[PDB]
Amino acid sequence: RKILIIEDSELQRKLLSRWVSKNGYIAIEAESISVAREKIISESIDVVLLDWELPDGNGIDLISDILSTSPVGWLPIIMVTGHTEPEYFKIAIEAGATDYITKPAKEIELLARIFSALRIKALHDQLRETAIRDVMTGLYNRRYMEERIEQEFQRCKRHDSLLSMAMIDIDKFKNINDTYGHEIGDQVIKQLAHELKTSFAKSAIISRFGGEEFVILFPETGVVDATRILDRVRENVSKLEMKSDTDQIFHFTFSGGVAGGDLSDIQSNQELLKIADKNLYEAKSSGRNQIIS
Amino acid sequence: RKILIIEDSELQRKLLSRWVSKNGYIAIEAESISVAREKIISESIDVVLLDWELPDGNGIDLISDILSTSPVGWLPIIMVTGHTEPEYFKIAIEAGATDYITKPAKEIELLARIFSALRIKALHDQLRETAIRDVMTGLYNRRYMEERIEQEFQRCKRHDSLLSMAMIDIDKFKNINDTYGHEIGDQVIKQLAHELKTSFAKSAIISRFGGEEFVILFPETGVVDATRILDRVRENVSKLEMKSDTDQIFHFTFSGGVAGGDLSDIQSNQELLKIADKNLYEAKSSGRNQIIS
Ligand SMILES: Nc1nc2c(ncn2[C@@H]2O[C@H](COP(=O)(O)OP(=O)(O)OP(=O)(O)O)C[C@H]2O)c(=O)[nH]1
Ligand SMILES: Nc1nc2c(ncn2[C@@H]2O[C@H](COP(=O)(O)OP(=O)(O)OP(=O)(O)O)C[C@H]2O)c(=O)[nH]1
Ligand SMILES: [Mg+2]
Ligand SMILES: [Mg+2]
Ligand SMILES: [Mg+2]
Ligand SMILES: [Mg+2]
Ligand SMILES: [Mg+2]
């Protein structure tokens, strides 16, 4: 849907952008490398059209940086340059570009190569989601959340920016499987997953870390702010009326351990895990159905 | 690794083929639509180079058939044609083609667009493997085995070919977790996984279907032959000396339900599941540590 066009020439850039917007895409113009970096950071991009010679650098150098910013990890990049030498073609593709059009770009071909780029991007995005999300709940699975804590932790140390973590665990869940069966247990987990998915800010990262265990990172959020939010959700879950398959009404609760905030005195990300884990056991021994931070 | 090249012209085809094999790919040549059909059916292909005007029809008609032989339903297809009309470009891409070179093809561009196609394919295939594999055992998970039974069922019906299925479940495994802990339980599961991985042929498809449950497809194997194989594995498992965390020796066994063979009477793949499931319950009620078929 959203396409970023990096070209120094006014005439060429306004032309390309008219063509692309005309077929129902959103066009994002960038007159320079400097303005391109600004647009990548600030807007989710599906395809890039990339000039080679910009007034403030070379497209090749920007390819690397685009792929490492991409929140999904791969993005189709199509070169649109005056450079016609086959050596320049091989270099761009090897640098990470997907396609390469020599100027002047022709409208029919351009829109068809964008079609082909977005088709592959759509398949990639689906394959990615099935690899990193848990099948039953559609939350992030463990093997991916581990990598994302690491990469999210480092990111917030190499910046003066807060990062709170919650670890939650369903109260007396083995008792629920024994009373109402595995199949009702599965439904309770699915219901909690759906409440977590819809209750937090869009930046919050939610994982199904174990059978009945969940971990949530809150970027740019203090420990106190994360705790009030998670305590509203815990209140909401406690007042849900669940039905068994024999029309028995029942409630469930979860316990929470919160950690992080100011990360100054926390050295590795695994120290963040253990503070949250210690707090969750605090919550379990302190009467359950509560958050501790 | 394997590239299919469909071109009517011997000079062009042997040239393209030399270029591709030169960069460490295997080249499969096809002089005509007729010979291409026979190569697609008989060899798994990573990329196709596709001429449009063949003596016995049009490449575009072949695109659809190529995409449906991919087990996930998508393959990089690069048009390499004399056709320079924008309508031929738009229709090839819309038909399913990924890329399009106008003749005369240059070696550098050709191999760089192949690189681009195979780079995407390699990332997709890795994302796929992480989505279909269970982390603990490294076997196929449930969501994938369900789809693969369907795929293998239909494919064994569209041939006069046998297909046996086993369903197994560990005997008194809750007792093993309760006596020796969750972590010894995890090792017992892993031990069974290792026995399955090393006991069956190359052709066997092995899945972790539940916590402690496994299903195995045996292509071109009778029910009687699948039963002795799974019974030799059951004998091997029963004679393993397992250690607790306090150097206590113990044995574990599984019960087996086998199904399928001649597929003539069998209507859907779900019927295969239930016959195996029924047999496994028979095996559990009959004294456990045994196979029933
Ligand atoms: N239905 C269902 N049950 C599960 C699943 N995964 C684990 N369980 C069950 O939930 C149990 C959770 O164990 P615990 O951490 O001991 O929690 P608990 O026994 O409920 O008690 P508490 O959390 O309050 O300590 C373990 C397992 O028996 C699942 O995917 N589905
Ligand atoms: N350690 C471990 N235990 C698991 C895992 N997944 C499930 N379990 C446990 O295994 C239990 C198996 O129970 P059942 O399938 O009823 O079989 P069983 O109790 O072994 O008895 P039987 O098949 O002989 O009737 C369910 C759960 O307690 C796992 O991943 N690891
Ligand atoms: Mg320029
Ligand atoms: Mg619990
Ligand atoms: Mg737990
Ligand atoms: Mg069992
Ligand atoms: Mg079982």
Residue numbers in the entry:
A (entry chain B), B (entry chain A): 6 to 298
What does the published report state?
C-di-GMP is a near-ubiquitous bacterial second messenger responsible for the coordination of a variety of cellular processes and behaviour, including motility, biofilm formation, virulence and cell cycle progression. DGCs catalyse the condensation of two molecules of GTP to yield the twofold symmetric c-di-GMP product. DgcR from Leptospira biflexa is a constitutively dimeric prototype of this class of diguanylate cyclases. Here, we show by biophysical and crystallographic analyses that DgcR is a constitutive dimer that changes coiled-coil geometry and domain arrangement upon pseudo-phosphorylation.
The structure of activated DgcR_AxxA (called DgcR’*) obtained by BeF3- modification was solved by molecular replacement to 2.8 Å resolution. There are two dimers in the asymmetric unit that show virtually the same Rec dimer structure, but slightly different α5-helix bending and GGDEF orientations. As in DgcR’, the dimer is formed by isologous contacts between the α4-β5-α5 Rec faces and the extension of α5 forms a coiled-coil, but with an altered relative disposition, which will be described in detail further below. D56 is found fully modified by BeF3- and its immediate environment is different compared to DgcR’ as will be discussed in detail hereafter. The GGDEF domains are arranged symmetrical with the two bound 3’dGTP ligands facing each other, but too distant for catalysis (bottom). Comparison of native and activated DgcR’ shows that, on activation, the hydroxyl group of T86 is moved towards the BeF3- moiety to form an H-bond. Furthermore, K108 forms ionic interactions with BeF3- and E12 in the activated structure. Activation of DgcR is accompanied with a change in the backbone structure as identified by a DynDom analysis. The Rec domain can be divided into two parts that undergo a relative 16° rotation as shown in Fig. 3b.
